[model samples]
Target: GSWFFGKIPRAKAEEMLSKQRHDGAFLIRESESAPGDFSLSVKFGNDVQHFKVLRDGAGKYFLWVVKFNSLNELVDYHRSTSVSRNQQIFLRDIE
Candidate 1:
């Protein structure tokens, strides 16, 4: 199987509720990426990786994934999916 459609052991695409809310607020299906070369075209959302990281884990730590959609779709998604208050925000000021 390919990386996108391959059999991967990904934590279910879900998000926790309230405070325990994890990095589970994903809308796409299962996806995967390599530690070295991770392309968003393959997998988009990832499971909560580090509990020590409370905020700005993904955008803060410089971790990113590719979304196979166009800019229009992204803008649309941006509208539909509001900023998650439970999510960590990386102001790009932390280490």
Candidate 2:
């Protein structure tokens, strides 16, 4: 899968995305403070944005509105669908 990078530091994720150099580049890494939780790191130009991925009681994963059965599903959906309507961010490339 393109998303999961297991347990990596926040700065490390940022470094990988920046070095990759794509507008909508992204990766998923385990949360630092909260174990079992996850974070979505996306590159927007020179900046990288982080969003927390929450799991529902039924074990579905979601960044905000939509829920997916797995992290890869979430990544695949966002590869074509934008995360936000305002900024229109999509997941592109991988680590």
Candidate 3:
């Protein structure tokens, strides 16, 4: 099973990666996505997580994928969290 994050602050990701680099913990690859977009494929242990790293014209840093904070990410369902499961709503019958 696998999952991904919407977007994360890029500075956080870079610092995390750099700290690991000192211990020889990860290998990474970069590629062009667009003029202001790029990606990083991070290999660590038995898993390789792919991330889309972006920089906007405003000089903001953004990472658009896998992060290393499963401990901080969780779910506690509430009022707006409930949805009909096992399916996706389509316009044809949702009317």
Candidate 4:
């Protein structure tokens, strides 16, 4: 019931986030590459930016350097901390 849309296509993710008026609204979806992996799509202006959510063998999730124990932790971390430091773009839930 959260922003995690499991098994949805990339186009569908884009369509859903497109309805948001503000930037940074995002959702997490299953990655096309692997079953254990995920992808993050965030609304950025008129476009949506996609990033891979890689899972380690130990079941840790990470975007770049930071590691999270769960998907919820990852999302919450990004909510207060901007994914892109220079861009000042923090993640916002679809509201």
lDDT of 2 by residue, 1-95 (tens): 26568889999988888887467888888987787798889887678899899998766888879799988789878888877777777888764
Q: Give the TM-score of candidate 4.
A: 0.88
Candidate 2 local lDDT, residue 58: 69
- For all candidates in order, the CA lDDT equals 0.27, 0.82, 0.33, 0.82
The prediction achieving the highest TM-score against the true structure is 4
The TM-score, computed over Cα atoms with residue i paired to residue i, of candidate 1 is 0.20
Least accurate 10 contiguous residues by lDDT in model 1: 36-45
For each candidate, what TM-score against the reference?
A: 0.20, 0.86, 0.30, 0.88
| TM-score-sorted candidate list, best first | 4, 2, 3, 1
Better of 2 and 3 by lDDT: 2
State in Å the error of residue 55, model 1.
Answer: 23
Candidate 4 residue spans exceeding 4 A from truth: none
Instruction: List runs of model 3 lying over 4 Å from the truth.
Output: 1-30, 64-95
Question: Where does candidate 2 stray beyond 4 Å?
Answer: none
lDDT of 3: 0.33
> Candidate 3 has which clashing residue pairs, if any?
none
lDDT of 4 by residue, 1-95 (tens): 25777778898889888987767888889877678878889886678989898887786998869799998899888887778767777777786
- By TM-score, is 1 or 3 better? 3
Residue-wise lDDT of candidate 1 within 1-95, one digit each (tens)? 11122223334322321123222322222235533222112111343332211113232211233342332343234334433346433211001
